Amino acid sequence: GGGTIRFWREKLEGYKKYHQIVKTIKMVTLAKYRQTVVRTRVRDQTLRYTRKALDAKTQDDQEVIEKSECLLYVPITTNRGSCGALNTNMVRYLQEVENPKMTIISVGKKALDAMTKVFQDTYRRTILNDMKQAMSFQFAAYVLEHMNTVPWDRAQIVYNRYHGAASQKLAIFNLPKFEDWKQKLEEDSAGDGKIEEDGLLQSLPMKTALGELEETAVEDFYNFHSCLAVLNAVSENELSEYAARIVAVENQLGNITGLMQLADYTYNKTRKELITAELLEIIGTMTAMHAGKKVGLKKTEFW
Template sequence: MSGRLRLYKEKLEGYNRFHSIVKTIKMVTMAKFRQAQVRIKTRDYTLRYTEKAFSKPGQLVGDSLQAKTVYIPVMTNRGSCGALNSNVVKMIDSVASSRAYLMPLGKRGIESLSKLYPSSFRMGIINDMHEPMHFAYATYIWENAQQLCPEADRIHVIFHRCVSAASQKQCYYNIPAYDKWKEDLVDASSTENQKSRYLFANTLLNEDEQMIRDFYDFHATLAILNAVCENELSEQAARLVAVEGQLSNISALQQKTSSLYNKTRQSSITSSLIEIISAMTSLEGNAAKGVQRTNFWEGARMR
């Protein structure tokens, strides 16, 4: 076997192994994507009351440049998920200041944001992703965010919502501090500034203080739970697209190398056949002229 033929054969074997590995990764990612897709189907039913609790007509994204804000960027533990993490970093870069407190979720978020914004970075949380996102995990995030800066004016959760397998949209939840939220609730119950929340605000304010606080914490935790679930689904969707691209690339390389290997092998076989036929033709020609050779090592003698 020639050196070039051996090279193509080794490359083709390597591409075949890599193709099988990437195909397995794609199947695993597809299964995780389907599971996350089923879990997120309840988001519209759970968030309708959360939206009623925290939405305020005419509210701006950035309440004040002087406001203390805790940012919770939801990021990933691994790469190969498109531009999810880089988009979050761009968002943080536009709002980073001395009054911003960062508490990223995910290994990639902690590694990148702690180096890019050391003055704003406070702590991070890593989930091993071995279990589905659950309410206890969201509660842990919410409690740590409140303890990180008790005097914060709001908590800003940045995540990606999965629109489709090929499209993920960056979104946010803006959760005001409890005191500011309650002031807004009193305003909604006593004036006509927020007619859509008038009955809701009056009903809630008739309850005791502990009940109001529990309602606030519960729906804030629900918002965080929805954010991490949406980001998990977006991560799997983006990784599915990335793996599909890798599979297409390796298939193209595999096909090209296979074609080169077959052509080189065919050329080698053709050359060998030509040599054999030439040798046979030469022997037949010598036999016709009367050359005899009883043994190969003996000299030829004429008849």
């Protein structure tokens, strides 16, 4: 019985050390989250003309695949785990959307081991920002320079949108190709302004004034707004990571607690049972010695 109680004691100490370690992770992530939440007050304003430029009606997939030749899907994953279902849900969405003409350039280490085992050939590489220095416009420029290795016809930038501390949903930016964007710009600048989808904005004057703009400046307009889109995606996934890690750490601490209470109950149970066992042993050996005493008179002469 000594081995059992020693084992349970070692498991108790292991769970306690594991608990304080996870608590330390929680404190670090809390510091980073309290930094990054300052962005939440200030976001939701920079991409509005980008929307107006790049957004289109919801195009069904199966027509986009036949229309296109080499799509692109950029999943923005994390550098380290204990996040939750963000990475797994991104992978699930892509294996839901998997089609013969795709190519995946990701962002994060966790897109490196997972996707390559699900997507053998479509997955190409990834991009890694060691988050010592906050993301930048030139990080998104790096990502654009990586995406442009392909002659892609559409780029679906997947990311996690931080609706709240308990709400980190998925989100997509469907970026067109430059030549296709320019052709659609002309074809929609000619005709009158009529929205074809609720929630979408008319931008015919913008699609004329861009025609007033020279060619190199329009290419710069496209690249600049796509860069801002990528940057908003990276920032939102950073915040979503740091917000979902807290949830996926407090639940770990709850599980660790429960394991610790079970370990404590079993340790104390084994302790008491061992005490009773040693007691009954001693009383048994003593009782046997008492039983080995005769009741005979053993009479002898006293004179």
